[PDB]
Every structure is written in C-alpha cells, then in structure tokens.
Ligand binder design. Structure first.
Ligand SMILES: CCCCCCCCCCCCCCCCCC(=O)OC[C@H](C)OC(=O)CCCCCCCCCCCCCCCCC
Ligand code: SF4
Ligand code: SF4
Ligand code: SF4
Ligand code: F3S
Lengths: 951, 99
C-alpha cells in the first residue's frame, strides 16, 4: 500500500501569453439585476471565473457588490443549465434552427412582419437596442413589447405626468440631511443600490469630530432593510401611502388633498413637514416603484417646492433604451395571441409563462401561436412549452454591453469560452437580420468601434467603464395642472395583499442557485420556503388564534414578561391559511412578522417554480396566479380563512428578542456629541454601580506590541442587513450548502451570520436591530484551551488558527465558544460527484470533509498571500522591512459590503483605519465579562431622533 | 422512604427505589448537559435538542453488551470470592471464642 495515488499532472501545449501559472488574474465585466448593469471585477484562477468583486472605478459599484452579483458564480456552474438546442424537446442543431428561422422570416416578408413579434426584458444594452431598431426598420410591422415582472412602469408613468416626458431620476444622498421614503426601498437591491447605500452610510457613520448626522423617515406596509436603518418608521397600509403623500403636500402648501388619517400617522406627517422647510435643498423625497404614478408625480412636486432639484435630486435623459409601461405591452401581446394575429413570437429570456400575471393566461394563448422561440440559459417552464428552445450564454462567458442607472455603457467581458456553447442575444438578432454565424465579439466590437474608437475600446476593456458615455443632465418643466388634477385613490376595501420581490430569489431566476436559497432572508430568517407575512394582531383576528395581542404592549418594567409572551405567540408560525384574492386560492403557510402593518399580508414572488433545476425544483407556493395586471403590487380584498394543517417552516435564529442582555448598544446623537463614551459609561452604572468595569484576568496572553495584529471593526449604524457578506464568505471559503432538513436540525454552516433582535416597547411596532456576527479572534480563546489534539491554537499575529487536518471532531470547542460561531461537518455536506461544483471551489481554501469543525479565518488565504508578497518585495529590495500596506488586505465580507460597515486592518499601526475606529468612544466588545479580549469589535449604534416625534 | 428501617428491609421496595434512582441519575446528567447547552449568552444562538432513534439504539446496545459480559462472567468465573468468605467465617468463629 502507498501513502497516495499516482496524481498524474497535465500541462499546456501552448502557454497563454499573459498568464503566470498559479497567479490569479482579475477582469472587468458587467452583471445586470434589473437590466441595469453593475460593474464587477472577477478573479480568474486558471481561466475559470471563481470570485466576483466590485469595480472601484464603476459608478454604483465602488468596491461594494449586491448578493445577486456575488452568487452569480454558482449560477454559472449550475449542473442544470441548458446544453443543447431543442426543437420540441428533442435535441437539434443551431444550423437547423438558422435554416428554419430564415425560412419563417422570408415567409413573413410577404407581409411587413405583421406576424413577427418580440418579447424581451428591460433592455439597456446599446448594441442590442440598435440591432432591434434595425430589425424593426427591416420589418415595419414588428413590435418589441418589453416586459419583466419587477419593472419601473410607475416611475416612467409619474415622470410622463409630472414633466410630460420620460426622465431618469437620480438621488445624491451625500448632500441630503433629511431623506423621506414613501414605501421606497433604496437600501434594498435595485437600480443604484450600492451607490445610494455608500452615500447614506457615510453620513450615518459618526466620530467624536463629526457634528452632523442624516435622518431617515420611512412609511411602508412591510418592514424592510430601509426600515431597519430609519430613525423613525411608520407601518402604514400600502394603499394609504398615496393619501399620506397627498396630505404631506397639502401641509407643505403644494397642491394635494387633505386625507383622514390615524393620530400616529398625523403626528408623523407633522414631524416630516416640520423637518422639511428647515432643510430646503438639504432634503430628498423618494417614492417606491410599487407605489402608484400619482405618488411619483407628488414627490417631484414636493422636491421642486423645497428647491431640492439640482442639489439632492437630478434629472437625466432616459437610460433604459425605450422606456414603456411593460404590463400594458404584455396585455396587448396576450390579446393579439388570443386573436391569433401573431404567427411568430421570439422571447429573449424573462420566463414569460411563469412571470406573467395569472389573469393573462399567457400559456394558453402561447399554444395558439404556431412558432415560439425562447433563449433562456435554462430549460424554463416557457422553454418547455416553446418550440426551438436555444441555450443562452451566461454573462460571465459572453461578449456584451450594458448601461448603469446613471448611464455608463460598461462592457461585459467573457472570462471563459461558453462551457455548453449557447448563443448571446445579439447573435440571435444577427440571424434574424440575415447574418447567420456572426460572432458576439465582432458584433459588440463593430458597434463600439467608430463610436469610441479602437483606442477607446482598449481603454474600455482595461477599465470597467466607458468614459465617453454618460446620461446628459436635462431640466424638465413640472406640469402643475396635470399633477393637481389626479384621482389620488382612497385606501380601504378589506384585508389587503402586498406583493414584494423575494430578498434572496429576486423574481425567481435565482431559485436554482443553492447559496441564495440557503441564505436566511433578512428580517424573517426563513430558509428554502415562502410564507405569508402578517403582524401578530392581523394573525389573531384573521386565523382566530387565542391570544390577546395587547399583552405584548407594555413599559420597560414588564419587558421580560412581554418577550416571553412573544415566544408563546410564536409556534403558531406555519399554520396554513387559504387566501382568496380574485378567484385564486394560494393555501400558503403564515409566518408572523412583528413590524408588519395591520390588515395587510406580504407574499414573496419567485417560489413554486416547476421546471427549475434539482435545487429549488418545487420550493414554496407560487404567488404569480393570484397577482393581477390591474393591481400588480397591491390587493383589495382577501378572505384569509384558517385551514389549520400546520406546515413546518424552517428559520435559522429561532429567537426574536434579546433577553435583557448588552448585545446591542443604542444611543442618541445629541448626547453622543457631548460625550462619545456616554453609552459605555451607562449600562456599567446599572450593572456594577461604577462607570468602568474592572475586569480581572488570571491568564497572561501574549504582548503583540511590535508585530502586525489583525482586527476587524463592524459599524452597527452602517449595516442594513443586506446579507451580501454571507454570500461573499460562502464563495471565498467554499462553505457547503446543507439541505432544508439539515437546517431544520440547526446544522447550517455559515461563518458569518446576521441577527435581528426586534427589541422595542409594544413589540407590535418593534425596532429591528441587525448585527453581523463572525469569529471574534479572541486573544484569550476558550475554544483553544478545551481542544485535546491542539487543532485550534493562536498565531504570532493574533489570529485564531483552526487546522482541519488536526481536528478529530470532539466538538468540545463549539460548547466553550461563547458566541457559538463554530460550525461542524456532521455529515458529508461538500459535493464530490458534480464536476461543475468542483470547478467553482476556490483552490486557495481546502474543501473540508465530514468530522472537522469550521470557523471564520479572517480570510487567512488573503493575509498569507500579502505576507509572502511583502517578504518577497523586501528581500529583493534588500530592506528586510516586511511592511504590509493598510489597504493591501481586504476580507471578502469587507469588499462585498455596499455600506462599508466592516473594516479590516492592523491594530498596532495607529494610522490604520481600524486603529482610528477602535479609538472611538463607542467601540466595544461583545460579552466583556468573559475575559476573552476579542479583536472583532462593534461600534454602538447612534440614532438622530426628531424632538417632535420622540419627545 | 429509605430513612425508615422497614422500607430498607423490604426487598420489593428496594428494587423499585433503585430503578427510580437509576432513571433519576440519567435525568440529572441530561439536565446538567443538554439544558445548559441549549440556551447561552447570545439569544440568537438558541435551539432545542431532540434525540433521534440511533442514540437510543446505542444505549440499549451498550446495555446488551454489559449484560452479555456479566452472563459470561457468572458462567465461567465464581460470583462470590471463595476465599475472604471462609476467612470471614474464621474471623467470626474467633470473635465468638473471645465473646
Ligand atoms: C490491527 C487491525 C486494525 C484494524 C484494521 C485496520 C485496517 C485499515 C486498512 C484501511 C486501508 C484499506 O483498507 O485500503 C486498502 C489498502 C490499500 O490495503 C491495505 O493496506 C490493507 C491494510 C491491512 C492492515 C492490517 C493491519 C494488521
Ligand atoms: S469567537 Fe469563539 S471560535 Fe472565535 S476565538 Fe472566540 S471563542 Fe474561539
Ligand atoms: S473575514 Fe473572510 S472568513 Fe471571516 S466572515 Fe469575512 S469573508 Fe468570511
Ligand atoms: S455587514 Fe453584511 S449584512 Fe451588513 S450591510 Fe454589510 S454586507 Fe450587508
Ligand atoms: S475541540 Fe478540537 S478536536 Fe476539533 S471539534 Fe473542536 S477543534
């Protein structure tokens, strides 16, 4: 027998010119979530994409990335991606499709293209738009008919009501001291999310020198990440927001309508109005895409009155190709299909049968159409019912161009030749235009050349942006008469339904991706499932649950009793409620959301897919059939009867409150300005009777005075609970995806977790607190002392070292870890039989086997690479300095965060950002009564409350 | 009940109390370990322990191994020390002589 197998090695036959073996490279490419491009820098280990990061020179992606961009790596390596062209579910060839397409188009040339119809999503690519325009020029009677489930129809409708022209609204949150959000999530993933998050967070971050902080007021039906980072939040019903906006305009004096409202809503209106007019040109009003067009028109009118336009709100020429009402265009197409006028339908992605509203009955009308061609990148439900399904190249493996919300014209660059082939959207358009076998690289290059030039093309590929292209600033004219003469529909028709895009699955495109499905949803902590979300009071009345719901309300004296009652109120989660909206019954299990508005239910789209891959093949209940074209984001009447039949719903946290413990510290800004250490000086007076706790240790530790020391500071004020960092850690450290059954047994493997504590008076309108938790790298570590084989030992720098090979699996270390951040491989979670998943795994980090513990390693692979590089540079110079720069090492979570809450740097170097942050008066370490001395510390949250609403 | 002499003398009473004590000691270990581990310093890391069938199978299997070893011991080797019992008789007879 021998120590190991032969381990043959296969080299190249011709070396790549610019590649040094074993050295990863970085390439600039663009990833689009809503059709709006976001610049990304992606690591190519050996010619294969492995890690997506942000492009510092790209507007809307300055280092930070959203979770959807991070989790694109596993999507590109899904073992369920389409591999061949299917005629009617039978494999075929691209040449046969090209011949058929040509014959069908020359058969439609007798007419002007009256049968030929298109169906794409929000297209912002200049190349595709130009090709589509040329195709429409060739066939005069063809139509484009864009549609996608999550669209900006209300925004353009409000723009065409306020200015009589489609404009692009941009918000400069850096110069806005007061921000008001009418059911708008600007801190949730969407157009311009990273840029808005970074600017908003920078103002919130407060030091002893800082004298000013921004204030956010948010009115919304469902609690959200934007709501979490708000000084004041009002849970108004979704329909009532339009009336609230009209009342706000009336008290400001701008055209509107007085609306009857609850006293709490009236007090909120008085505070918002009083804060405005005190910050003219220093305020912005943001209206959500879900809200009706009148709300958008009023928001433009309010901004103009306060003079905010040109200072905080900027108008630009439309960036989304031809802006249009997508839902109306789909309704026009379905009527034509029912009539039978359409003879050819070509769809570039968008999963229309599943995505389209139930009332439309797109699938039944799709059968009438003789030929329907779909390019999806997967065999989706639409592709199954469509002839001539064609595989679509993934953005990572395709040549393409995209435009950002500001307007950037960034270029998508392939990192690998397509694994299963497949054709890009531009290549499909070329075949329709009469040029078959046209390369994607030539099509994009030919359009860009002579517009930016060959030299511009070279600069554009090297950077992530095209400097020449940007949206021009325009000054539109506000039509007072049109905005004033609007119905402003009144709320109230019985129980209402709110439709919201899923935080992790978006529109359901990412349902196949394992990382996103396993990710705990922010504010509900649910995994692998969809549940109706309702306030505790709503559940008691509609489902007849036997609880008072007024017991939760109370003062600080009975807070512990009310927290226990909330735990008793839980355990009713998972009861199935049959909900009838407009002839449709969902039968969905219910999960209690404390912050939710009364008489309102939130249903998340993106679940119940039937033709998705083996992961998420049948997860959750589809909400698309109940959804209607007339009212896409809102509902009027729901029966919500209780059928009992409770169904298990799996959540990671399992507890919704802090039990009277100092885990999260919250303080006012005015007191903070007088003394930064006031929050820390307090608490210790209640617990020990003295301002400073005199903790005493019997264990020496190590000096660490003259050596690099690695520490992390997380800012509570900055964090919005996006969960991008959790996805970034999973991609970087090759963390396994456990099944729903393993999560049910509490065996989920996540190095970084975000905890929502929901701690407040009343508990029916609680203040959500999101805290990111990762290994604290404690200088004196309890886990190390209890390890029999010495698998866990400290490091010269101060990093805790977990060696998987040494670990025998005793599990004593997890028991002695106070923060419970250690995850154990109880079963063989890692995938060994899937070739595509094996390609995805990063070479720098080992793939753990069953029986070994795992914990956050401060991205040791990055630290080791920097240490080796610094030593190599010093010896070549002869200095022997071994100096590491402050920005040289950035952890995957630090790069991913859009807000910038996580900072990683040397602690000893007093000029480093972490050293300056750790010298702040509100910095503290969790569970100080245990002499662990953590290196990962937190900055206590500082709020900015208005004296009107608060006092 | 053990405090009273009559209960200690009764053989059935001793057997019932001994079985109850054996179950109670198992429950004491359960309380010390599992309950303490279930809830800790951070409320977010709170979960319930529910034993499966396989750990119970191991428990009955260990009982079976224990009783198998006992039965082979009593079959092959003497249960009562043959010497130190006749020496006990010698000591008792000598005590009677010295009254
Ligand atoms: C003392 C008995 C200790 C328990 C038995 C341990 C045997 C473990 C052998 C595992 C390696 C194996 O079976 O793979 C086939 C190997 C190449 O083929 C082998 O090397 C077989 C090795 C047999 C070792 C027998 C020790 C006596
Ligand atoms: S946080 Fe837990 S695992 Fe990390 S060093 Fe401290 S005790 Fe060990
Ligand atoms: S430092 Fe690295 S390993 Fe630790 S939580 Fe962040 S990404 Fe994960
Ligand atoms: S710390 Fe994580 S969850 Fe919080 S804002 Fe940053 S990326 Fe999002
Ligand atoms: S106690 Fe030690 S043996 Fe492994 S499971 Fe923990 S590092």
């Amino acid at each position: 027998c021998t120590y190991q197998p032969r381990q043959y090695i296969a080299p190249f036959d011709r070396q790549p010119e610019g590649r040094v073996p074993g050295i990863p490279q970085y390439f600039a490419s663009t990833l689009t979530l809503g059709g709006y491009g976001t610049g990304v820098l992606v690591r190519s280990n050996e010619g294969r994409p492995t890690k997506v990061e942000g492009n510092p020179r790209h507007p809307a992606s300055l280092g930070g990335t959203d979770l959807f961009a991070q989790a694109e790596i596993l999507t590109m390596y899904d073992p369920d991606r389409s591999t061949t062209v299917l005629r009617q579910g039978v494999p075929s060839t691209w040449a046969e499709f090209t011949t058929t397409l040509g014959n069908a188009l020359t058969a439609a040339r007798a007419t002007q293209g009256a049968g030929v119809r298109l169906l794409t999503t929000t297209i912002t690519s200049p190349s595709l738009a130009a090709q589509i325009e040329q195709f429409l020029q060739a066939y005069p009677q063809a139509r484009w008919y864009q549609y996608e489930p999550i669209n900006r129809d209300n925004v353009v409708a409000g723009a065409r009501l306020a200015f009589g022209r489609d404009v692009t609204t941009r918000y400069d949150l850096s110069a806005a001291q007061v921000v008001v959000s009418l059911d708008a999530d600007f801190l949730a993933p969407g157009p311009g999310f990273v840029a808005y998050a970074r600017a908003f967070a920078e103002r919130r971050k407060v030091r002893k020198d800082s004298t000013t902080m921004n204030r956010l007021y948010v009115v919304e039906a469902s609690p959200s990440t934007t709501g979490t980072a708000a000084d004041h939040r009002l849970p108004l019903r979704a329909d009532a927001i339009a009336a609230f906006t009209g009342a706000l305009a009336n008290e400001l004096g701008v055209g509107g309508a007085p609306a009857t409202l609850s006293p709490k809503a009236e007090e909120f209106l008085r505070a918002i109005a009083r804060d405005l007019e005190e910050h003219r040109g220093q305020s912005v009003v943001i209206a959500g895409d879900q809200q009706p067009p009148i709300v958008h028109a009023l928001a433009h009118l309010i901004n103009a009155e306060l003079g905010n336009v040109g200072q905080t709100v900027f108008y630009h020429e439309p960036v989304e190709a031809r802006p249009t009402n997508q839902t109306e265009e789909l309704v026009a197409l379905v009527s034509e299909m029912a009539a039978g006028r359409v003879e050819t339908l070509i769809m570039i992605g968008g999963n229309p049968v599943y995505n389209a509203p139930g009332d439309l009955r797109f699938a039944d009308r799709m059968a009438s159409v003789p030929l329907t061609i779909h390019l999806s990148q997967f065999v989706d439900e639409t592709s199954a019912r469509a002839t001539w399904h064609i595989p679509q190249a993934h953005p990572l493996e395709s040549w393409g161009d995209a435009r950002a919300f500001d307007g950037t014209a960034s270029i998508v660059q392939p990192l690998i030749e397509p694994l299963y082939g497949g054709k890009t959207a531009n290549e499909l358009l070329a075949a329709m235009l009469g040029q078959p076998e046209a390369e994607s690289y030539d099509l994009v290059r030919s359009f860009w050349l002579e517009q930016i030039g060959e030299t511009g093309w070279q600069v554009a590929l090297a950077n992530g942006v095209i400097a020449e292209t940007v949206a021009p600033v325009i000054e539109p004219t506000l039509n007072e008469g049109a905005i004033r003469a609007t119905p402003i529909p009144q709320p109230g028709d019985g129980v209402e339904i709110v439709f919201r895009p899923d935080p992790s699955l978006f529109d359901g495109f990412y349902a196949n991706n394992g990382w996103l499905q396993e990710l705990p949803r922010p504010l509900t902590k649910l995994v692998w499932d969809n549940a109706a979300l309702m306030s505790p009071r709503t559940a008691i009345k509609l489902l007849g649950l036997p609880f008072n719901a007024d017991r939760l309300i109370g003062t600080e004296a009975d807070d512990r009793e009310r927290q226990q009652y909330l735990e008793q109120l839980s355990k009713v989660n998972g009861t199935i409620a049959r909900i009838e909206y407009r002839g449709g019954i969902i039968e969905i299990p219910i999960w209690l959301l404390p912050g939710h508005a009364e008489d309102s239910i939130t249903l998340n789209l993106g679940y119940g897919r039937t033709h998705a891959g083996r992961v998420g093949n049948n997860v959750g209940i589809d909400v698309y059939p109940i959804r209607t074209s007339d009212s896409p984001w809102f509902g009027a009447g729901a029966r919500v009867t209780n059928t009992g039949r409770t169904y298990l719903l799996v959540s990671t946290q399992d507890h919704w409150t802090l039990e009277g413990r100092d885990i999260y510290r919250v303080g006012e800004f005015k007191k903070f300005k007088e003394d930064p250490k006031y929050i820390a000086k307090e608490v210790y007076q209640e617990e020990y009777g003295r301002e400073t706790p005199n903790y005493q240790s019997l264990q020496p530790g190590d000096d660490y005075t003259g050596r690099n020391a690695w520490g992390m500071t997380i800012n509570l004020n900055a964090c919005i609970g996006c969960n991008a960092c959790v996805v970034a850690c999973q991609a970087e450290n090759n963390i396994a995806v456990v099944g729903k059954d393993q999560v049910s047994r509490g065996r989920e493997m996540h190095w970084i977790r975000i905890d929502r504590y929901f701690a407040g008076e009343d508990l029916d309108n609680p203040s959500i607190y999101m805290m990111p938790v990762n290994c604290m790298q404690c200088e004196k570590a309890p886990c190390e002392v209890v390890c029999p084989v010495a698998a866990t030992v400290h490091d010269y720098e101060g990093l805790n070292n977990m060696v998987y090979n040494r670990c025998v699996g005793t599990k004593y270390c997890s028991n002695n870890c106070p923060y419970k951040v250690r995850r154990f491989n109880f079963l063989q979670y890692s995938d060994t039989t899937t070739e595509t998943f094996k390609l995805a795994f990063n070479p720098d980090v080992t793939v753990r086997i069953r029986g070994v513990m795992e914990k956050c390693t401060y991205c040791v692979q990055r630290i080791s690479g920097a240490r080796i590089a610094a030593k190599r540079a010093a010896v070549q110079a002869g200095q022997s300095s071994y100096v590491i720069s402050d920005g040289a090492i950035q952890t995957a979570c630090e790069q991913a965060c859009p807000t910038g809450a996580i900072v990683f740097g040397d602690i000893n170097d007093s000029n480093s950002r972490v050293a300056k942050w750790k010298a702040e008066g509100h910095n503290y370490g969790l569970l100080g009564f245990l002499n662990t001395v953590p290196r990962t510390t937190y900055l206590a949250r500082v709020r900015n409350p208005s004296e009107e609403l608060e006092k | 009940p053990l405090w009273f002499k009559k209960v200690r003398q009764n053989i059935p009473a001793l057997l019932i109390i001994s079985l109850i004590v054996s179950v109670g000691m198992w429950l004491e270990r359960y309380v010390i370990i599992v309950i303490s581990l279930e809830r800790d310093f951070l409320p977010s890391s709170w979960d319930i322990y529910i034993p499966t069938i396989w750990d119970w199978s191991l428990y009955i299997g260990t009982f079976g191994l224990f009783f198998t070893l006992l039965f082979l011991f009593i079959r092959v080797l003497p249960m009562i020390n043959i010497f130190e019992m006749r020496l006990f008789l010698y000591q008792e007879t000598e005590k009677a002589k010295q009254r």
